[PDB]
Coordinates of C-alpha atoms and ligand atoms in Angstrom, one line a residue:
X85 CA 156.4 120.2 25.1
X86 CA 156.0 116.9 26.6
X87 CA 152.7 117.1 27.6
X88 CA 149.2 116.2 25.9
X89 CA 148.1 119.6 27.3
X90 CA 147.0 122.2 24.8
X91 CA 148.1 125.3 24.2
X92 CA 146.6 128.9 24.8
X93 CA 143.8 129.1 22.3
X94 CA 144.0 132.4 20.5
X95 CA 141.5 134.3 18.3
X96 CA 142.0 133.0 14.6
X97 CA 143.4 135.3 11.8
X98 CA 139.9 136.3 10.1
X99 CA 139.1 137.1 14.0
X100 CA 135.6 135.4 13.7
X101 CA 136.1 133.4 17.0
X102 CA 138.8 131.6 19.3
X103 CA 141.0 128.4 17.4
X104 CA 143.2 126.0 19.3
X105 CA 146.9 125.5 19.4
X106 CA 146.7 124.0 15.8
X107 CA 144.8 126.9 14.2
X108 CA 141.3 125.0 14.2
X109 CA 138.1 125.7 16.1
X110 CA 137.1 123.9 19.1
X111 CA 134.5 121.4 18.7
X112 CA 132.4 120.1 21.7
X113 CA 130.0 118.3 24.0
X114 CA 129.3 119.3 27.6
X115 CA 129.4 118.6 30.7
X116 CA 128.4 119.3 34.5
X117 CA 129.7 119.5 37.8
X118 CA 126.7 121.6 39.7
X119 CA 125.6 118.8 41.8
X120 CA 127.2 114.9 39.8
X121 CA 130.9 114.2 40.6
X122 CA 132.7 114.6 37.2
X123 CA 132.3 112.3 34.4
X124 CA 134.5 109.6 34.1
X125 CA 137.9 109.6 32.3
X126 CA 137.1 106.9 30.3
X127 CA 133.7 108.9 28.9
X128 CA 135.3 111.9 28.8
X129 CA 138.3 110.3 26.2
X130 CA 134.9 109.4 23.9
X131 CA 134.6 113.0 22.9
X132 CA 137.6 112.7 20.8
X133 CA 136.4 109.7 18.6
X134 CA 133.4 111.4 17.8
X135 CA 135.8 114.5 16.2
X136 CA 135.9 116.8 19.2
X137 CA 138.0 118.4 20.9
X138 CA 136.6 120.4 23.5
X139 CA 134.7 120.3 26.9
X140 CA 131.6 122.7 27.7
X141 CA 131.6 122.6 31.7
X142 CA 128.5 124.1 33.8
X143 CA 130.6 124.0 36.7
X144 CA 128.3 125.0 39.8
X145 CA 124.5 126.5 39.9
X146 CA 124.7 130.0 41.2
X147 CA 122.5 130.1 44.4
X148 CA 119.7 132.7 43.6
X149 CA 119.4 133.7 47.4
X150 CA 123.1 134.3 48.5
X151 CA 124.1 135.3 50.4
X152 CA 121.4 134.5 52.9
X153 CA 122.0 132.3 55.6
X154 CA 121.8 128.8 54.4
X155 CA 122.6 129.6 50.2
X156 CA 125.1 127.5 48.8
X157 CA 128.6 129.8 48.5
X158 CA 130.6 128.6 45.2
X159 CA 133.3 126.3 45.2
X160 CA 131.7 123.5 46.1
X161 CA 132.4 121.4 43.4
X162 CA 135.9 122.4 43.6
X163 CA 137.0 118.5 43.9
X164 CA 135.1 117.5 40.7
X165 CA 136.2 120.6 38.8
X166 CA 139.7 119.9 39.4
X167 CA 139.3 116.3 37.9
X168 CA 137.2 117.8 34.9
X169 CA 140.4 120.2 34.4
X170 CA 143.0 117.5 35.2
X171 CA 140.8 114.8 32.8
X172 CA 140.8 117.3 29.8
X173 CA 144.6 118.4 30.5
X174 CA 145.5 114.6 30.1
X175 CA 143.4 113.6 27.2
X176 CA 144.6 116.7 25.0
X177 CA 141.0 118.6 25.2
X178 CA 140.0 122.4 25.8
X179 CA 138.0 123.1 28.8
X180 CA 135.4 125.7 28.6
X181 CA 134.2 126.8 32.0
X182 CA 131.1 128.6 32.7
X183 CA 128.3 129.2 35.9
X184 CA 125.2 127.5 35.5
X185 CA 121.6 128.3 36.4
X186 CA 119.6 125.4 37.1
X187 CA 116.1 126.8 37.3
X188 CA 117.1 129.8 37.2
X189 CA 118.2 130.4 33.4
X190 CA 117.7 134.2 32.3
X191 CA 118.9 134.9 35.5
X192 CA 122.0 135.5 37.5
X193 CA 123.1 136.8 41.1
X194 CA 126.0 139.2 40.9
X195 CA 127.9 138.5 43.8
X196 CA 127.5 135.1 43.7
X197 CA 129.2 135.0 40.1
X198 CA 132.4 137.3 41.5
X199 CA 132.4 135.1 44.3
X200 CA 132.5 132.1 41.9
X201 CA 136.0 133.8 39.7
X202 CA 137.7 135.2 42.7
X203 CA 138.0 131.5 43.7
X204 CA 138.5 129.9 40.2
X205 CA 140.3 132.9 38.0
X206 CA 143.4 132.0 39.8
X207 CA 142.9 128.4 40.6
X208 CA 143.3 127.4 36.8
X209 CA 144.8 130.8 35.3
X210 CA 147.8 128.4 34.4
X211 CA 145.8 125.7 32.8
X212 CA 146.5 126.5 28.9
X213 CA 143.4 124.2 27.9
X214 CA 140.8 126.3 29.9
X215 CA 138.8 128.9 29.1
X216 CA 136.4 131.1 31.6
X217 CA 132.6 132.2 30.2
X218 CA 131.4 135.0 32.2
X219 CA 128.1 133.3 33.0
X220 CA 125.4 131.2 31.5
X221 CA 122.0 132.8 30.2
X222 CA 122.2 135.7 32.9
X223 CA 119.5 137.3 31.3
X224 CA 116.4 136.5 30.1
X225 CA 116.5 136.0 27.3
X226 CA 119.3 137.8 24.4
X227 CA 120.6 141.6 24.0
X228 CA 120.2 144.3 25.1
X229 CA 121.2 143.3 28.3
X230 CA 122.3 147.7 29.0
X231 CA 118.5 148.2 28.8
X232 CA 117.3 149.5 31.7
X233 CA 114.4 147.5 31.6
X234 CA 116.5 144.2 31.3
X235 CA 115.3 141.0 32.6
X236 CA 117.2 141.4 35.2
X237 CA 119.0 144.2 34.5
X238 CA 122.8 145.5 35.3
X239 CA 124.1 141.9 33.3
X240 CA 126.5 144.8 31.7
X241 CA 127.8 145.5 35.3
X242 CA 128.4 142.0 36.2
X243 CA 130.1 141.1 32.5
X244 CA 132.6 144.3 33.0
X245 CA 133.1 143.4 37.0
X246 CA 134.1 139.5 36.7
X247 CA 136.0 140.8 34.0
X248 CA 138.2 142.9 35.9
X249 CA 138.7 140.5 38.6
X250 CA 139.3 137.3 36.1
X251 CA 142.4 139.6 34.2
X252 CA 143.2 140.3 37.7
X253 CA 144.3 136.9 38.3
X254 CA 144.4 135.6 34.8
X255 CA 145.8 137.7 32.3
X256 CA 146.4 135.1 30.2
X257 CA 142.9 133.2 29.8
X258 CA 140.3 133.8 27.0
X259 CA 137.1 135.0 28.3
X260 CA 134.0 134.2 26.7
X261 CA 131.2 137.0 27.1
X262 CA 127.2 137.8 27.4
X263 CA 126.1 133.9 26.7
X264 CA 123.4 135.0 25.0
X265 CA 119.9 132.7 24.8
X266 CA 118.5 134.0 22.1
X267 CA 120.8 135.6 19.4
X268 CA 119.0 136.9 16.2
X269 CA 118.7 138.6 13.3
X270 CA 119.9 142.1 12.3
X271 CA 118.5 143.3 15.1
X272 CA 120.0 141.0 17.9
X273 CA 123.4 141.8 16.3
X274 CA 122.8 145.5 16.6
X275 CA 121.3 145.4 20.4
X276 CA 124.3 143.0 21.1
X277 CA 126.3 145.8 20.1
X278 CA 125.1 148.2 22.5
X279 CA 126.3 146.0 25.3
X280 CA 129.7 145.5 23.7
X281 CA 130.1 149.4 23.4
X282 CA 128.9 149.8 27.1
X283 CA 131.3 147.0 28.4
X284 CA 134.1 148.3 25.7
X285 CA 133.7 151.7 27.3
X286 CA 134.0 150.6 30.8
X287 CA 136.8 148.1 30.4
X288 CA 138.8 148.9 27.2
X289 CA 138.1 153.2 27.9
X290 CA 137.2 153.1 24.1
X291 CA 133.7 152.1 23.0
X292 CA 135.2 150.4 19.6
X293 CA 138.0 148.4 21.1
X294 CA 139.8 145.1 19.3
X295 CA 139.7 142.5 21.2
X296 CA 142.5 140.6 21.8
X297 CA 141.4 137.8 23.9
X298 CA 137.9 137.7 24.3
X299 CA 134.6 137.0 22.3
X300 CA 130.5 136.8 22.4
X301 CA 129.4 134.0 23.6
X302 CA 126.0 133.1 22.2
X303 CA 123.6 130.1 21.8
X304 CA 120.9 128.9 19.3
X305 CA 117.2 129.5 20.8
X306 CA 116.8 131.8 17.8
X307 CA 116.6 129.1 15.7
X308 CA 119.4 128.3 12.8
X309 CA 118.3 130.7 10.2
X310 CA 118.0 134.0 12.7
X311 CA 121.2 132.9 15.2
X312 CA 123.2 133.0 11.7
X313 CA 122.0 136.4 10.5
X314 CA 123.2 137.4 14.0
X315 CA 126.2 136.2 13.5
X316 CA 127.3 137.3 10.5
X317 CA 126.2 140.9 11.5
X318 CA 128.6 140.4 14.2
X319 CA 131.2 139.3 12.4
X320 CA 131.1 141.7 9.9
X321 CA 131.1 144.6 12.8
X322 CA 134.0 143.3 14.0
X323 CA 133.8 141.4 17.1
X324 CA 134.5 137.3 17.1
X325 CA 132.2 134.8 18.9
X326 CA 131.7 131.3 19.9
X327 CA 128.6 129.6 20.3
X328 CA 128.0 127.4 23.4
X329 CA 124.9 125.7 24.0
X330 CA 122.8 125.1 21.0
X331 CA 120.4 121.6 20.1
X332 CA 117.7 121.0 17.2
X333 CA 120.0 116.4 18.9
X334 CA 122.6 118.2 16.9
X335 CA 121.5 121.3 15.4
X336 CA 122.9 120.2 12.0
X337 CA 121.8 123.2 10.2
X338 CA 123.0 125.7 12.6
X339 CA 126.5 123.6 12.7
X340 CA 126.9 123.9 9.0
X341 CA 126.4 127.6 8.7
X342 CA 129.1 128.2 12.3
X343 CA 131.5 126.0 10.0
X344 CA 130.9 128.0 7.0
X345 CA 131.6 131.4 9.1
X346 CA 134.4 129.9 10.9
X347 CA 133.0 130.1 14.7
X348 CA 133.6 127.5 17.4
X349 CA 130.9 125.7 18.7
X350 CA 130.0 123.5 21.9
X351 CA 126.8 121.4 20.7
X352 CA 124.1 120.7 24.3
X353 CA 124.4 117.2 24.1
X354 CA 126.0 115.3 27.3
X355 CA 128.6 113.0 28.0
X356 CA 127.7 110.3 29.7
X357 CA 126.5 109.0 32.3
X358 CA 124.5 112.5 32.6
X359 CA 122.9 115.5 31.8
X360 CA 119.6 117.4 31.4
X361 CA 119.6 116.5 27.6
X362 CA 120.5 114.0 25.3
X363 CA 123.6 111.5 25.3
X364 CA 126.1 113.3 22.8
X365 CA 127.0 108.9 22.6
X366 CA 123.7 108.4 21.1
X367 CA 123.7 108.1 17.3
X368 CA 120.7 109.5 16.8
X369 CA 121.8 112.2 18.8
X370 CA 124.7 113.2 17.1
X371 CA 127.2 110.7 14.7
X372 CA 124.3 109.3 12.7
X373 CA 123.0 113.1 12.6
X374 CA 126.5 114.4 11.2
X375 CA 126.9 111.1 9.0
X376 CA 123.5 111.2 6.8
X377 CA 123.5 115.1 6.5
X378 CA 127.6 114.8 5.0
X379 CA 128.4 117.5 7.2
X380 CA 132.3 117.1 8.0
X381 CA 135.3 119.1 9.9
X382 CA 139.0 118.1 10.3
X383 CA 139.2 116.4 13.9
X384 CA 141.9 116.7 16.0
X385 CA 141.8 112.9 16.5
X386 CA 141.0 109.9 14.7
X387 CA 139.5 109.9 11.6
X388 CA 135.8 110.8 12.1
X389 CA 134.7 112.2 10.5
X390 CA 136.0 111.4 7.5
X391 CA 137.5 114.2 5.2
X392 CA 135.3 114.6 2.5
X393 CA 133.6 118.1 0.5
X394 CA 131.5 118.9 -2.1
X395 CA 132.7 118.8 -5.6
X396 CA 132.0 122.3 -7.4
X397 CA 129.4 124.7 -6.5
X398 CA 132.2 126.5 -4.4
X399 CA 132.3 123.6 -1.7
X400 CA 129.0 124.8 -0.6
X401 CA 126.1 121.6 -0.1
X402 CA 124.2 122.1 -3.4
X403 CA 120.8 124.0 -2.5
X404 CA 117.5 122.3 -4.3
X405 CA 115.6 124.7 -6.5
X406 CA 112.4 126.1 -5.9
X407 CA 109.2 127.7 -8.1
X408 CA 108.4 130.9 -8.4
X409 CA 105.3 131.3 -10.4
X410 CA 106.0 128.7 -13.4
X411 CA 110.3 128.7 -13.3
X412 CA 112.7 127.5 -11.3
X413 CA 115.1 129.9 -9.1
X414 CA 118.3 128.2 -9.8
X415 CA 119.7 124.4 -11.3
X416 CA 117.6 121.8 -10.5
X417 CA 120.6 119.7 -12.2
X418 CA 123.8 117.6 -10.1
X419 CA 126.2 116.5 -12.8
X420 CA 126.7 112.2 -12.2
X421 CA 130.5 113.2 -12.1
X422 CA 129.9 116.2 -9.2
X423 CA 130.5 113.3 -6.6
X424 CA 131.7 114.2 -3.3
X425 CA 135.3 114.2 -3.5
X426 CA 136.3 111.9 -0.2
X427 CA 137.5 108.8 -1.7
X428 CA 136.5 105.0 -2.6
X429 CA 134.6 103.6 0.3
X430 CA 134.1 107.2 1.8
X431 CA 132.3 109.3 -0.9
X432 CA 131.8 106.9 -3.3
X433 CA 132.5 102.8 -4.0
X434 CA 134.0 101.9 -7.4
X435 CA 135.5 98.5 -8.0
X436 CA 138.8 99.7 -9.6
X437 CA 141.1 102.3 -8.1
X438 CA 141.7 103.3 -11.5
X439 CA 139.4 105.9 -13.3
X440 CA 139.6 103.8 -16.5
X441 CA 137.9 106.4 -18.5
X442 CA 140.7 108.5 -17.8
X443 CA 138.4 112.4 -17.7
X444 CA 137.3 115.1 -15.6
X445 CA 138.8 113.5 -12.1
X446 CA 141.4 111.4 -13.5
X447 CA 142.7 110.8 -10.3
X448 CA 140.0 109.6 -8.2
X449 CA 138.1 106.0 -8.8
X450 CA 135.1 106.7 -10.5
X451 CA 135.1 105.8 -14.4
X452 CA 134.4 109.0 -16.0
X453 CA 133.9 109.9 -20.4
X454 CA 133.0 112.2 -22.5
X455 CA 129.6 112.2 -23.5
X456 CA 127.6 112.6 -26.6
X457 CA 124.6 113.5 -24.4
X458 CA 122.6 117.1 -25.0
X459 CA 124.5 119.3 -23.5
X460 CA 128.2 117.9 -23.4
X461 CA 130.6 117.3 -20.7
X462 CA 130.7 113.9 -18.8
X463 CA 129.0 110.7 -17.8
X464 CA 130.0 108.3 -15.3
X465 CA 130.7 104.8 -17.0
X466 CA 131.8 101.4 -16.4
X467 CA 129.1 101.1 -13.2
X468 CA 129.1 97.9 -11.6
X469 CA 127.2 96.6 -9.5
X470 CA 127.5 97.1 -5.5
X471 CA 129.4 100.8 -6.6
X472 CA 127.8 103.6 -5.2
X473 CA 127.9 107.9 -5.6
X474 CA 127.2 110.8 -2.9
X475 CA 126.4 114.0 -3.1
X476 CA 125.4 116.3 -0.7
X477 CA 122.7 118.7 -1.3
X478 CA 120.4 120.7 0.9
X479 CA 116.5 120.4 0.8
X480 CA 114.8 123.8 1.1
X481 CA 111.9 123.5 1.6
X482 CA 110.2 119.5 2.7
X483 CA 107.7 117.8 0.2
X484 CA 107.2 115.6 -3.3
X485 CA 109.9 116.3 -5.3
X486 CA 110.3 114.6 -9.1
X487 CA 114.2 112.8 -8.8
X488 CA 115.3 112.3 -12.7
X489 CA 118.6 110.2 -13.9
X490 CA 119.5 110.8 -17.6
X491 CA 120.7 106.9 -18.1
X492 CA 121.6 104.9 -21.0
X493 CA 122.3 100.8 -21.2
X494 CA 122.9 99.1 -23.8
X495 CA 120.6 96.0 -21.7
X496 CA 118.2 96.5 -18.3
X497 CA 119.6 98.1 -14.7
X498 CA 118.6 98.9 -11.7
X499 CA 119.2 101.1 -9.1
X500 CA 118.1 102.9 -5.5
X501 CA 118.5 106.0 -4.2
X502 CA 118.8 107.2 -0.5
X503 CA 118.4 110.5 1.0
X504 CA 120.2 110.5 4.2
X505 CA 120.7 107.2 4.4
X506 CA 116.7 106.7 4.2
X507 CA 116.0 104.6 0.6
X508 CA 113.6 107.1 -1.2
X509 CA 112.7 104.6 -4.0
X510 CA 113.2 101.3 -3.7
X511 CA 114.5 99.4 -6.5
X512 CA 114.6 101.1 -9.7
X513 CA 114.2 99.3 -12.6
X514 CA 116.0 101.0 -15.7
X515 CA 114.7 99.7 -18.9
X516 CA 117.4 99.4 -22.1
X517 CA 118.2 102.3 -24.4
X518 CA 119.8 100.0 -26.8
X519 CA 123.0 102.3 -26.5
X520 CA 125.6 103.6 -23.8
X521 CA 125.6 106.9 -25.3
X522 CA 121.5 106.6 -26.4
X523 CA 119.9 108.9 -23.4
X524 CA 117.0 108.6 -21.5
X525 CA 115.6 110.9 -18.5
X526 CA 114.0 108.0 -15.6
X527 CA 111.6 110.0 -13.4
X528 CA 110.6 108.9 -10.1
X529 CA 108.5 111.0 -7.1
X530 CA 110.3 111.4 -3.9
X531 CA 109.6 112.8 -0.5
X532 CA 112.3 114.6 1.4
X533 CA 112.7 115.7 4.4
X534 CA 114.6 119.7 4.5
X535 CA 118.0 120.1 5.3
X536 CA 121.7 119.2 5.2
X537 CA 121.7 115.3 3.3
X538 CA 123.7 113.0 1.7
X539 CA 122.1 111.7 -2.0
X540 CA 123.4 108.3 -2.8
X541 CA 123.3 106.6 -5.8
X542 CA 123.0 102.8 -5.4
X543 CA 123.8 100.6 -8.6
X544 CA 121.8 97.4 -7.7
X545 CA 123.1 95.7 -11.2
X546 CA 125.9 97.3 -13.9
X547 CA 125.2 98.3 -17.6
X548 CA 124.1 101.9 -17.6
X549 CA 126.2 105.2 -17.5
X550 CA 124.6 108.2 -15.4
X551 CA 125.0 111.4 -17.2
X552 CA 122.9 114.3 -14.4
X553 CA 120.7 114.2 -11.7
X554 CA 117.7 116.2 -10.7
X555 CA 115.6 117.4 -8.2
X556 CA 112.6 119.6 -8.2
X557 CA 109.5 120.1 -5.8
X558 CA 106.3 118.9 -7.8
Ligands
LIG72 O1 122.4 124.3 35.2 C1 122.6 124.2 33.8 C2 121.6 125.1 33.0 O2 122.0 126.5 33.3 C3 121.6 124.9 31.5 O3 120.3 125.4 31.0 O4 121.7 123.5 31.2 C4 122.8 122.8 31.7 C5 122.5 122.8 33.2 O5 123.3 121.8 33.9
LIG73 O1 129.8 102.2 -19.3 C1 130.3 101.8 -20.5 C2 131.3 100.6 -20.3 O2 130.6 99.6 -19.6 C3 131.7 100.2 -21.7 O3 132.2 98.8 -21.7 O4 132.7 101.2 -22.2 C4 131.9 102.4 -22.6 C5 131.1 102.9 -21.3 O5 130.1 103.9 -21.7
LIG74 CA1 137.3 102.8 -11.3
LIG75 CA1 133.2 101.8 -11.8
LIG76 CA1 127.3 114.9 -16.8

């Protein structure tokens, strides 16, 4: 159509959460309206050259006290609202709009938050970009919210009342449910699972009902590792999700296990001029977080970031070993010619375009042979200097680990490796073998930080090949 607006998002095909008009998640920053006028176009179109495209909205604060004389009905912030939904509409975004708490997180006021969709279900029911959430954090603080000694309790009641009244109106519009503050383990996917059934039973007159247009909304104050046991228990029970409001910054961890699972995310980080975080703008907020950890996702527009995957090791990041007693629990080894795949000034540099060894990756720019090297397979060859390798690996655990290169060179090198874009050794001299195919293993003692990280390979001169990497704590 000729329009920049996006269509109806729809659960994907694996049903793990809600994808846009072009079959990928939505990707976001946020925003609020509760008491700023809405942020500018001009920031707004920023989210889309940082590889989003999506809008997390706290549209008004529900007024704990209404509604007394004096409390603050909703729809107050219906003039900013309208430009949030008009701004996204324009610049080809999804708009994900939700009530928000202000102090008052783990918390809600029923009335207020029908109130609050009997005014705005219909308003943008015809907006294709948008996208209603029940209600943000309404209780304190995760499932299950059915307990009768919820804090509060009746959240259930609320969830299944707004959404009656938000089909009502909007039959159309994906509704995001629960917004869950702390979503955990086995354990919070099985108590989340009581309040589905309840809600399912009320709603759907079945307590095992398929959605069709809705899923859990959930955030990260578990922490990475539990929020993605959670979700994959979820998951695996059937019901999609969508997590929206998660930090560490970027929770980069948590980020590249919702990729991995295929859920949607909106990341707490504000655009500007405002918020009650951190400037999603910032690099060391956000780009510089995704670019030294090699994290990437196919934007909707632009080219950042770049595409770009593991090579091997099933696309996964490549996991560092760790001791048990006296072995190692998996391969401490990266083979040289394991580089990202990405291309030449992306995931690696190489002077010719040409693979002039003509192996392994015959089609990409690195200079790759056969090697005589214990062990077989390849080295990479013809290194010059200024060319550079990346690899993306995950620290387990942080510490001294021993980084080895099995190099050869016929005369002296030298080289420097970074670890997120942080140099980890600083020059390396490599001493002759006397031989190109005549091996040496070059130790040197590294401290890492854990996580998600690029590992570049710097060739500060040419004249040595670079069989394998490894990395192991000391
Ligand atoms: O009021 C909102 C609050 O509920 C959430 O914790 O952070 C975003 C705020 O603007
Ligand atoms: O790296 C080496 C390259 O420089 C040499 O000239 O051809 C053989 C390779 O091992
Ligand atoms: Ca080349
Ligand atoms: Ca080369
Ligand atoms: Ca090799």
């Amino acid at each position: 159509a000729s329009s920049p607006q996006r269509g109806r998002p729809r659960l994907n095909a694996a049903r793990t959460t809600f994808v846009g008009d072009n079959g990928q998640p939505l990707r976001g920053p946020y925003t609020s309206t509760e008491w700023t006028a809405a942020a500018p176009y001009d920031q707004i179109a920023r989210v889309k050259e940082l590889g989003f495209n999506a809008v997390h909205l706290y549209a008004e604060c529900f007024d704990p006290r209404y509604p007394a004389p004096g409390s603050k009905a909703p729809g107050y912030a219906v003039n900013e609202i309208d430009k949030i939904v008009e701004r996204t509409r324009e610049l080809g975004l999804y708009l994900v709009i939700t009530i928000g708490n202000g102090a008052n997180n783990g918390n809600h006021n029923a009335q207020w938050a029908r109130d609050f969709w009997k005014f705005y279900a219909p308003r943008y029911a015809k907006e294709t970009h948008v996208l209603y959430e029940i209600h943000n954090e309404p209780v304190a603080w995760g499932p299950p919210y059915s307990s009768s000694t919820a804090n509060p309790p009746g959240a259930v009641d609320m969830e299944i009342d707004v959404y009656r009244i938000i089909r009502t109106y909007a039959p159309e519009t994906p509704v995001l449910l629960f917004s869950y503050a702390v979503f955990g383990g086995k354990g919070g996917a099985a108590e989340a699972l009581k309040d589905i059934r309840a809600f399912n039973k009320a709603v759907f007159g079945n307590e095992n009902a398929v959605w069709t247009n809705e899923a859990v909304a959930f955030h990260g104050y578990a922490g990475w590792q539990e929020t993605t046991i959670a979700v994959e228990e979820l998951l695996k029970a059937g019901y999609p999700c969508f997590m929206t409001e998660y930090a560490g910054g970027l929770d980069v961890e948590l980020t590249y296990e919702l990729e991995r699972l295929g859920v949607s995310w909106l990341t707490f980080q504000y655009i500007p001029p405002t918020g009650v975080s951190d400037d999603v703008t910032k690099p060391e907020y956000f780009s510089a977080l995704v670019e030294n950890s090699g994290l990437s996702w196919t934007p909707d527009y632009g080219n950042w970031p770049a595409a770009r995957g593991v090579y091997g090791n099933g696309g996964l990041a490549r996991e560092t070993a760790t001791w048990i007693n006296n072995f190692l629990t998996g391969t401490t080894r990266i083979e040289a010619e394991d580089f990202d795949w990405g291309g030449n000034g992306v995931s690696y540099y190489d002077t010719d375009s040409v693979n002039v060894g003509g192996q392994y990756r015959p089609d990409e720019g690195v200079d790759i042979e056969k090697t005589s090297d214990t062990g077989g397979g390849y080295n990479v060859g013809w290194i010059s200097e200024g060319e550079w390798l990346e690899y993306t690996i995950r620290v387990r655990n942080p510490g001294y680990y021993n980084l080895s290169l099995r190099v050869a060179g016929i005369s002296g090198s030298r080289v420097q490796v970074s670890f997120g874009n942080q140099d980890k050794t600083g020059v390396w001299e490599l001493p002759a073998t006397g031989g190109f195919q005549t091996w040496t293993t070059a130790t040197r003692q590294v401290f890492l930080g854990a996580g998600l990280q690029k590992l570049r390979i710097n060739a500060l001169s040419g004249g040595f090949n670079l069989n394998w990497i490894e990395l192991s704590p000391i």
